[PDB]
Amino acid sequence: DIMVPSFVYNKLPVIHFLQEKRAEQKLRRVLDETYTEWTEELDQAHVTDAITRSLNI
Amino acid sequence: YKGEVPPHYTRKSSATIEQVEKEIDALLGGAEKLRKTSTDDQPMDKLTLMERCLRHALWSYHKEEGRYDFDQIGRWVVYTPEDEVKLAQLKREVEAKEKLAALRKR
Amino acid sequence: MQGSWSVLKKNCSNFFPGLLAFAQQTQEAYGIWLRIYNRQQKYGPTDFVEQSETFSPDYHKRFHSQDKNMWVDKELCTEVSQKEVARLMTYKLDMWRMAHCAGALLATGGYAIPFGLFWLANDTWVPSSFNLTGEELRAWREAQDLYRYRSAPSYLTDTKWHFDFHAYPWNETQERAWDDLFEKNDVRRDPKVVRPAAEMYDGFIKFELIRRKSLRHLCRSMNIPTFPMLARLCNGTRVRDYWNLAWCEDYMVITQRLHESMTDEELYDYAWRRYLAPYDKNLNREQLMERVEDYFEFLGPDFVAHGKAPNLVILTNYVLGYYNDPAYLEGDISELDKNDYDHLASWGKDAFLRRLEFENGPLRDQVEAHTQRLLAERAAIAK
Amino acid sequence: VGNGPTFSTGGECMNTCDIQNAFPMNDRGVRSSSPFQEPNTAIYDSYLAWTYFQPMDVHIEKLPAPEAKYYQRHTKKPWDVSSTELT
Amino acid sequence: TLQQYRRASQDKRLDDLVDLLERFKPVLAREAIMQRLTIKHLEGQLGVWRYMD
Numbered sequence A: 001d002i003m004v005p006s007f008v009y010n011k012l013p014v015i016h017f018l019q020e021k022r023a024e025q026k027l028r029r030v031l032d033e034t035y036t037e038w039t040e041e042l043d044q045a046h047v048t049d050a051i052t053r054s055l056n057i
Numbered sequence B: 001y002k003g004e005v006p007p008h009y010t011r012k013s014s015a016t017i018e019q020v021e022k023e024i025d026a027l028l029g030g031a032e033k034l035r036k037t038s039t040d041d042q043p044m045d046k047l048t049l050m051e052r053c054l055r056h057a058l059w060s061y062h063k064e065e066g067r068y069d070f071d072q073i074g075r076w077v078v079y080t081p082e083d084e085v086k087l088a089q090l091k092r093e094v095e096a097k098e099k100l101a102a103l104r105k106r
Numbered sequence C: 001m002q003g004s005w006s007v008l009k010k011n012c013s014n015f016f017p018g019l020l021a022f023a024q025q026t027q028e029a030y031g032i033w034l035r036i037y038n039r040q041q042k043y044g045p046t047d048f049v050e051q052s053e054t055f056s057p058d059y060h061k062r063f064h065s066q067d068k069n070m071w072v073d074k075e076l077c078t079e080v081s082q083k084e085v086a087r088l089m090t091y092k093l094d095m096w097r098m099a100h101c102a103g104a105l106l107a108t109g110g111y112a113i114p115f116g117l118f119w120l121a122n123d124t125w126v127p128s129s130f131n132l133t134g135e136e137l138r139a140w141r142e143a144q145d146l147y148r149y150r151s152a153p154s155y156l157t158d159t160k161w162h163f164d165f166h167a168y169p170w171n172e173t174q175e176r177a178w179d180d181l182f183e184k185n186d187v188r189r190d191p192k193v194v195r196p197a198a199e200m201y202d203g204f205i206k207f208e209l210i211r212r213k214s215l216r217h218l219c220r221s222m223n224i225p226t227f228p229m230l231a232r233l234c235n236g237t238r239v240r241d242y243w244n245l246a247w248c249e250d251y252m253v254i255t256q257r258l259h260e261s262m263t264d265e266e267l268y269d270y271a272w273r274r275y276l277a278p279y280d281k282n283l284n285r286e287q288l289m290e291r292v293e294d295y296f297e298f299l300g301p302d303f304v305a306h307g308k309a310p311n312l313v314i315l316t317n318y319v320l321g322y323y324n325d326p327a328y329l330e331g332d333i334s335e336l337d338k339n340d341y342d343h344l345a346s347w348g349k350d351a352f353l354r355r356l357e358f359e360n361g362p363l364r365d366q367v368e369a370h371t372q373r374l375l376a377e378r379a380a381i382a383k
Numbered sequence D: 001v002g003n004g005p006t007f008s009t010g011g012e013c014m015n016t017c018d019i020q021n022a023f024p025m026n027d028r029g030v031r032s033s034s035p036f037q038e039p040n041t042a043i044y045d046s047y048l049a050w051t052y053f054q055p056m057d058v059h060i061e062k063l064p065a066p067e068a069k070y071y072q073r074h075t076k077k078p079w080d081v082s083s084t085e086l087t
Numbered sequence E: 001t002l003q004q005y006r007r008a009s010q011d012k013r014l015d016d017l018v019d020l021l022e023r024f025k026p027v028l029a030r031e032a033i034m035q036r037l038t039i040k041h042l043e044g045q046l047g048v049w050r051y052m053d
């Protein structure tokens, strides 16, 4: 009735703060893993050059 | 050059990109009053981080699809000089192919 | 699970058929265990067979050592099949509970009968053989899962709190592993990220130094009877035997890829015996396979290479994390619009409360300035 | 404003307690008496110093109510008793 | 042909975006709950039992 409730009450703030920090850490890790991917595709100039070779020009 | 068609992947969900964009807009619209701007060098907020991540993913998907809206891509995707360089290359290629069409049609 | 009259009737009806089935299972499991024990004694390492002594560095109390007193029989498939091992494990659980009940009966003579009535009214401690139909088996499994839910969070909190209050991780990767190990089951934990916590806790506490209270919590979470607990080296022996059998079966399955060919119900039972898949979650084959593969990955390549599993304490914490459901929250958000201290409104504010409101209210700056100016004037007059 | 109590403090000054970092600090430099944010927290100096928070009428931009799906967790168990019911 | 190539990757990205949205929604819900709790706290009408619940 008295002791355990008082100690739980004393615990509450630190746990709340630590859990808030943990959530912010999760969000930060989520953000840090985002990178914009740039893909390289075969230049069409080579395709045009090959077309010329097929044209036998 | 590409290789071969990659193995089929099944959407574990089902929603159009338009539906996703509308959902994102609704989610970010309710927090506009709470959302507060700050200096670039200052730490960001939860709303700002969520908006940046969502818009980055959305605009990356759009650019991959073909909706080359550079005005928003330069805002929600540019975070590195490499991004700016590859965007410039993409912006010249896109706008050059367009011009060449008019010359080749006329 | 709380006792009920319906469960009491169910168990009373199936009491003697259950005992007969238990006796038949006892014969079969004795045969299986005889085979396994002979194989261990013949091909087991010298330390394992001789029961090498490992003493704690503080009070020199002997306890089973994971490296020496636990051995994985890579070639057990020749003599014993996976199904036989699972049968042996289930019978070990049932025999433990039945042995405790029989010991109580022998100790207290005919005075245990009302306690037997209490026992039969709950499916928590009755053998699986007492269920003669699918619905009864489902209810029994639900009771076992309820007990696991009741017990596991305490064990997890004990471990986490003791470590976090008496030590900290060395490097960032260990920090991430420790933080992600104790996440709620609603999220999926990557075994690769979490594995280093095993080495960290080996640095902190091995299975040979496990405390008696933590052991009691673990036994509660594993549906192992704990009364009378006695010395920590009895339930510790039970846990060691169960996990040794589980590791042998896991090695067999991994080597032979039996889980892929394993049917849905058998796969679910296999996961359940590993404390990975509660029945109340109604998991499908995809989720069961994902969790089983995660468990195998957590075991790591070294398990197949040498038969050395990670720290048993951290392994138990990881597996039991699936029973750590998110803390319940029921009620609409509108309930936050009410007031909790309306009954005090009639009392009003006394003089001290009025003073505090005046000093720390919106006019606080004005009052502070006035008070400081008055005090400065009085001090100047005094000088 | 009402005369109701607030988060209990135990007569501790949060600017010097062993867990002071868990209490947010306001602009005035006075740490809060509760995990929440308090603008008008103060410190009083009796034989021992103690932190005090005076409730006041303040408006905060209220985010719209979310859906019940995203904050309700129906994991209640027969043994579970809520803090309100316990009270 | 390119669409056939850039189809599975696009599907995975879309699913990841949906999952990210579903992951962010609970955070906003918690933030709203904390805002309401703070509002009641500043009025002196918040009990510890309610906060823990």
Ligand SMILES: CCCCCCCCCCCCCCCCCC(=O)OC[C@H](COP(=O)([O-])OCC(O)COP(=O)([O-])OC[C@@H](COC(=O)CCCCCCCCCCCCCCCCC)OC(=O)CCCCCCCCCCCCCCCCC)OC(=O)CCCCCCCCCCCCCCCCC
Residues within 6 Å of the ligand: C026, C029, C030, C033, C095, C096, C097, C098, C099, C100, C101, C102, C103, C104, C106, C107, C228, C234, C237, C238, C241
């Ligand atoms: C009539 C006199 C009565 C006297 C008073 C008694 C008072 C009650 C005390 C308890 C007595 C026993 C009760 C029955 C238990 C069931 C049998 C048994 O041992 O089950 C195995 C099982 C062993 O547990 P474990 O942890 O797996 O063992 C680890 C070992 O490594 C296991 O080794 P392993 O890993 O190599 O595996 C081996 C396993 C492999 O086998 C298998 O896997 C197959 C299955 C075998 C076991 C089957 C058990 C079935 C139990 C249920 C039976 C049916 C119940 C039906 C109920 C309803 C009926 C209507 O086989 C075994 O389990 C063999 C264990 C060794 C034998 C133990 C028995 C010794 C006593 C009997 C001989 C007496 C000789 C007297 C000579 C007199 C000369 C003058 O027993 C238990 O669960 C332990 C008992 C739990 C209760 C403990 C309560 C406190 C006891 C304190 C006693 C202190 C000394 C006495 C004084 C007390 C003063 C206060």
Ligand SMILES: CCCCCCCCCCCCCCCCCC(=O)OC[C@H](COP(=O)([O-])OCC(O)COP(=O)([O-])OC[C@@H](COC(=O)CCCCCCCCCCCCCCCCC)OC(=O)CCCCCCCCCCCCCCCCC)OC(=O)CCCCCCCCCCCCCCCCC
Residues within 6 Å of the ligand: C001, C002, C003, C100, C101, C102, C104, C105, C112, C113, C115, C116, C117, C118, C119, C120, C121, C122, C124, C125, C227
């Ligand atoms: C036919 C059948 C088949 C054959 C037989 C087969 C074998 C059967 C036997 C084996 C069965 C084993 C399994 C049993 C499972 C069930 C155990 C159990 O009881 O569960 C709780 C069970 C309910 O279980 P449940 O609802 O299923 O919940 C289970 C949960 O999982 C909750 O689980 P939990 O874990 O939370 O519960 C555990 C709880 C279990 O405990 C309890 O739950 C407490 C139960 C009693 C509560 C009583 C509350 C009400 C009090 C009323 C007071 C009187 C009111 C006024 C009456 C006015 C009448 C006119 O705590 C403990 O385990 C503590 C253990 C304590 C051990 C103590 C050891 C002492 C050793 C001493 C020191 C020695 C040191 C060494 C010295 C050496 C020296 C040389 O409790 C009850 O049913 C309560 C019954 C209350 C009866 C009425 C009040 C007493 C009436 C007395 C009448 C006296 C008449 C004569 C008077 C003469 C005067 C001259």
Ligand SMILES: CCCCCCCCCCCCCCCCCC(=O)OC[C@H](COP(=O)([O-])OCC(O)COP(=O)([O-])OC[C@@H](COC(=O)CCCCCCCCCCCCCCCCC)OC(=O)CCCCCCCCCCCCCCCCC)OC(=O)CCCCCCCCCCCCCCCCC
Residues within 6 Å of the ligand: C100, C101, C103, C104, C107, C108, C111, C125, C216, C225, C226, C227, C228, C229, C230
């Ligand atoms: C506001 C006021 C309210 C009212 C208050 C009333 C006044 C209370 C004031 C005093 C209270 C504190 C007293 C403390 C004393 C010191 C205790 C101590 O030092 O313990 C150390 C230590 C602590 O135990 P532990 O093993 O570490 O774990 C204890 C936890 O509670 C284990 O917890 P867990 O969670 O790990 O396990 C949970 C679960 C786990 O589930 C299981 O374990 C499976 C089921 C197991 C069933 C039992 C298996 C037993 C196997 C054999 C044990 C050895 C027998 C030795 C030979 C027999 C000796 C009698 O176990 C259970 O549910 C246990 C069920 C037990 C039910 C019985 C509890 C007593 C209720 C009253 C009935 C008797 C009334 C007599 C007086 C009235 C007569 C008219 O005790 C032991 O080592 C246990 C030794 C037990 C020996 C047998 C009992 C000897 C005492 C005399 C019995 C007389 C019987 C008379 C029959 C009727 C004649 C007419």
Ligand SMILES: CCCCCCCCCCCCCCCCCC(=O)OC[C@H](COP(=O)([O-])OCC(O)COP(=O)([O-])OC[C@@H](COC(=O)CCCCCCCCCCCCCCCCC)OC(=O)CCCCCCCCCCCCCCCCC)OC(=O)CCCCCCCCCCCCCCCCC
Residues within 6 Å of the ligand: C055, C060, C061, C062, C063, C230, C231, C232, C233, C234
């Ligand atoms: C209603 C019934 C009433 C019953 C009353 C009787 C008492 C209760 C009965 C039993 C109750 C159940 C629970 C008992 C405790 C269980 C402990 C436990 O879990 O052990 C697990 C453990 C199993 O674990 P494990 O891994 O296999 O092996 C343990 C490891 O070695 C562990 O490795 P470690 O690293 O820990 O190694 C250390 C370990 C090493 O020890 C062991 O573990 C080995 C086993 C014990 C060996 C004990 C004998 C040592 C040599 C004695 C030499 C005496 C020579 C005297 C010559 C005199 C010539 C004139 O421990 C020690 O070093 C301790 C040594 C003993 C020191 C004794 C000091 C006594 C001081 C006396 C002060 C003065 C007294 C008053 C004045 C008297 C004189 C005027 O069990 C055992 O090893 C043996 C358990 C034996 C249980 C007791 C059996 C009771 C039989 C009762 C029969 C009589 C009944 C009378 C009834 C009367 C009417 C009612």
Ligand SMILES: CCCCCCCCCCCCCCCCCC(=O)OC[C@H](COP(=O)([O-])OCC(O)COP(=O)([O-])OC[C@@H](COC(=O)CCCCCCCCCCCCCCCCC)OC(=O)CCCCCCCCCCCCCCCCC)OC(=O)CCCCCCCCCCCCCCCCC
Residues within 6 Å of the ligand: C061, C211, C212, C213, C228, C230, C231, C232, C233
């Ligand atoms: C309603 C009330 C009615 C009246 C009630 C009357 C009450 C009388 C008050 C006086 C009683 C004092 C004794 C209290 C015992 C409980 C202590 C306890 O729970 O402490 C927790 C204590 C705290 O542990 P923890 O803090 O969790 O962890 C610390 C360590 O990590 C733990 O790590 P660990 O487990 O590895 O280390 C411990 C373990 C490590 O050691 C081992 O593993 C090796 C085991 C070696 C065993 C050696 C046995 C030697 C026996 C030789 C017999 C030779 C044959 C003789 C035959 C002819 C003569 C009969 O060593 C032991 O604990 C065993 C020590 C030797 C036990 C001897 C048998 C019990 C004697 C009880 C009577 C004592 C005198 C009483 C009168 C004076 C009182 C001032 O845990 C233990 O000690 C666990 C084991 C407990 C065993 C004793 C209890 C067994 C159950 C009793 C059954 C009989 C019931 C009779 C009922 C009578 C009703 C009237």
Ligand SMILES: CCCCCCCCCCCCO[C@@H]1O[C@H](CO)[C@@H](O[C@H]2O[C@H](CO)[C@@H](O)[C@H](O)[C@H]2O)[C@H](O)[C@H]1O
Residues within 6 Å of the ligand: C037, C038, C039, C041, C042
């Ligand atoms: C009341 C008491 C109740 C007791 C209950 C439990 C009883 C258990 C009995 C088990 C009997 C096993 O049977 C026993 O097995 C061992 C191990 O294979 C055999 O052991 C044999 O092979 C081993 C291994 O190569 C050799 O180290 C040993 O020298 C040799 O004898 C025994 O020759 C055999 O007799």
